[PDB]
Structure 1
Amino acid sequence: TFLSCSQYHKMYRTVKAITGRQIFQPLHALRNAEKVLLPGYHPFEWQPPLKNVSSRTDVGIIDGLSGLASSVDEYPVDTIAKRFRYDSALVSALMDMEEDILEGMRSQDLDDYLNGPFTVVVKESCDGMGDVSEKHGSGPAVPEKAVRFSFTVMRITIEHGSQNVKVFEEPKPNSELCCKPLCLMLADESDHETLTAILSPLIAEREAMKSSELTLEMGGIPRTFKFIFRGTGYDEKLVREVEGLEASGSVYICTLCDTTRLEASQNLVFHSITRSHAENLQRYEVWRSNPYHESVEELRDRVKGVSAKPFIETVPSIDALHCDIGNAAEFYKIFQLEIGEVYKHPNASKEERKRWQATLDKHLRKRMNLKPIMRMNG
């Protein structure tokens, strides 16, 4: 309900005085349950030592700078960043979903004294926020932009005997209610230096725990967990920026295949997914070393677009609204072309196409009774 503490205490004491008995609970037990539910409360362990990661398990929010010296004689930086510990937030999410996964296991013809190794599919995502500053002193002061890095659990499975059984499947993972956040930064999305400096420890811990075994207590029985991470909650801009590709410019535009715009326009269905992460690393190494001594454009075409060093392995995907609007735009364009009898006209003028679009919009507003607009949407 987005309630503060003073007014909550006021309502609490008012209800306690009116009803006589105590029905609500004061801020003491509330904060107690809060700090109990927050990450970094219950113990856990890992069979591998988890190198480069401490073994302390009673810490929560920490500075996102990761001990970055920001004194006068260093690189200027003032973006305040806060973060959780990846393992801590992960075990906290697992603990708060323990009840749901136990209910699912009981429903799926399974007992309670079961051991792992459970398999948890965890997806990661991060995106900016835009203006988050309500400046009212003198008006628009600064376009302060923020960013959040988060994760989400959407699949929990267990393999017993021969086959497996999905004891937990998220009903709607594309929602704003199961987006467990890791870190928050007051940095621009275009600021590559600060973003990389803040996201490097998270990626380090991720790569460290990618091949580990979690051991946790749920109901008095030790349970073993393994995790499979998937980067698929990034838009095409962030994928193209992080994976070392160029901007939205030159002919190299596909993120799943190494084709070009001209090759795609010539051969439409003649491509398959080939852009991996190790391939991009090798292409960047070739770009940096240039073991053939070729011209700029020669090696640029040889590396096929990539010109920067990627640092986050991602699994690209595609959105439904985008794949629908990309086809609707071409349908609208081919309709505009076909309502002008262009197969007979050798040339095409701007006034001709303008009048054709005007006639099309007029007929549409007359028949279907809608409002045409050049701003294409979904």
Structure 2
Amino acid sequence: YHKMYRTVKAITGRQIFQPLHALRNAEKVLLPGYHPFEWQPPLKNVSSRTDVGIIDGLSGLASSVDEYPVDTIAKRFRYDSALVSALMDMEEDILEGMRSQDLDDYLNGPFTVVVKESCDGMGDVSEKHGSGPAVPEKAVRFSFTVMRITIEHGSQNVKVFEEPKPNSELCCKPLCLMLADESDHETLTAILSPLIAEREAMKSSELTLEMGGIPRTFKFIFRGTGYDEKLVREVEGLEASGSVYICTLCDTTRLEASQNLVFHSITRSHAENLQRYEVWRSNPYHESVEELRDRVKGVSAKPFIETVPSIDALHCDIGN
């Protein structure tokens, strides 16, 4: 780019492109950790320093020899700062959206923002032309997407912004990257747990920002739907695949699923799953193993991530 800039600057005489330091300032205005903001609740267990960028994903782990070994490399953003920078990015669009929906350019909040939540591993990333097989080298991202923004006036709410392509590649902003296996359980939860803590601290807070020359206030709502099947059976605490328990919503066995076809409901939730795991720990009625296995409906591990599951049409008609 420096070559192209200097060659066109020489051949035209005019400086049509820009040099590199201006490019660095133009990218420093768009990273996380630049604009100021505050929160109306003071956000417990969160450092309120407001100019942090790429931080180490391990949150200060314990990489000494005398500790449990972990050789993964994880880099992350703080959650609030990335959310702030995403809102400051979509500032002009939300301005013209609320103009187009027949309202004023001056309007205080609260804007309520509904956010897609996702995670996925990307398999192999190694490039070895020879030297035998080098390394399998599995890695995984953790990302989010602003799905919709809404606002009320008095009692009448209005969808002020909707996104046209939800699952596309150009709207999946990443929080954290780590070079680790998807099923390597303890490293995965050990890196992902502080972002969960930041999310649950953020759930009951109020953001205040200064986008359109005037302050705005924000609440938030998170939908953990962007997971795949093997991962949602792994990180919620269910059996992997070989159980009699196949439904991630209803507790219908494989026996009853062939028998009863449609007459079920949705009966799985997070707090009851925590309670079921506590039942599995305590074993209050001193029963045998199999009756616990059918009493808890496949609950084996401690749940630690809230997740509302869904499907996609490809799996539907391919099963058909």
- Structure 1-normalised TM-score? 0.84
Aligned to 1:335: none
The alpha carbon displacement at 1:211 in A equals 0.5
- C-alpha distance after superposition, 1:80-105 (max 9, x if no partner): 00000100000000000010000000
Give the equivalent residue in structure 1 for 2:51: 58
Shift of 1:159: 0.7
* Distance across 2 between alignment mates of 1:199 and 1:191: 12
Measured after TM superposition, the shift of residue 279 of structure 1 is 1.1
1:32, distance to aligned residue in structure 2 (A): 0.5
Summarize deviations over 1:175-216 as a string: whole Å, max 9, x none.
010001000000100100000000000000000000000000
Q: Deviations over 1:303-328 (max 9, x none)?
A: 0111101100000001100011001x
User: Following superposition, which runs of at least 4 residues in structure 1 exceed 3 angstroms of deviation?
Assistant: none
Of 233, 250, 261, which aligns to 1:268? 261
Matches within 5 A, 1:194-205: 194-205=187-198
CA distance in 2, matches of 1:283, 1:180: 34
- Cα deviation code 1:249-295 (max 9, x no counterpart): 01111111111111111010111111000111011000000000011
Q: Deviations over 1:208-238 (max 9, x none)?
A: 0000000000021000000101100001111
Q: Distance in 2 between matches of 1:249 and 1:227?
A: 37
| In 1: Cα distance, 2:126 partner to 2:108 partner | 49
Aligned mates of 1:128, 1:173 — CA distance in 2 = 19
1:135 Cα shift? 2.4
The aligned counterpart of 1:88 is 81
For residues 137-192 of structure 1, what are the alpha-carbon distances to aligned partners after superposition, in whole Å with 9 as ceiling and x for unaligned?
A: 51321100010000000100001112111110001111010001000000100100
Take 1:136 and 1:73, find their aligned partners in 2: how far apart are those partners?
A: 37
Give the match's secondary structure for 1:274: coil
Distance 2:52 2:126 in 1: 29
Structure 2: how far apart are the matches of 1:137 and 1:51?
52
Q: Distance in 1 between matches of 2:277 and 2:242?
A: 19
1:182 aligns with 2:172: no
Write the distance in 2 (CA, Å) between the matches of 1:113 and 1:161. 15
Identity among equivalent positions (%) equals: 100
SS of equivalent residue, structure 1 residue 82: strand
Distance, in Å, in 1 between the alignment partners of 2:303 and 2:130 is: 41
1:37 is paired with a residue of what secondary structure? coil
Is residue 115 from structure 1 mapped to residue 104 from structure 2 by the alignment?
A: no
Q: In 2, Cα distance between the equivalents of 1:99 and 1:28?
A: 25
Indicate the RMSD between aligned Cα atoms, in angstroms.
0.7
Partners of 2:291 and 2:160 in 1: CA distance: 53
Give the Cα–Cα distance (whole angstroms) in 2 for the partners of residues 65 and 262 of structure 1. 44
| Partner Cα separation in structure 2 for residue 161 and residue 50 of structure 1 | 28
**Using the alignment, how far apart are the partners of 1:44 and 1:97 within structure 2?**
16
Which TM-score applies when normalising by structure 2? 0.99
Structure with larger RCO (C-alpha < 8 A, sep 6+): 2
SS of residue matched to 1:182:
strand
Give 1:36 shift.
1.0
- Kindly indicate whether residue 51 of structure 2 is the aligned counterpart of residue 22 of structure 1: no
Return 5+ residue gaps in structure 2 as ranges: none
Quick one: distance in 2 between partners of 1:179 and 1:247? Answer: 27
Counterparts of 1:98 and 1:286, CA distance in 2: 48
Q: Which residue of 2 aligns with 1:352?
A: none
Aligned to 2:293: 300
Could you tell me how far apart the structure 2 residues matched to 1:220 and 1:323 are? 48
Unaligned ranges ≥5, structure 1? 1-7, 328-378
Partner of residue 286, structure 1: 279
Q: 2:278, 2:37 → 1: CA distance?
A: 40
The residue that corresponds to 1:105 in the other structure is 98
Aligned residues: 320
Tell me the secondary structure at the aligned position of residue 145 of structure 2.
strand
Q: What's the offset of the Cα at 1:31?
A: 0.5
Distance 2:99 2:113 in 1: 18
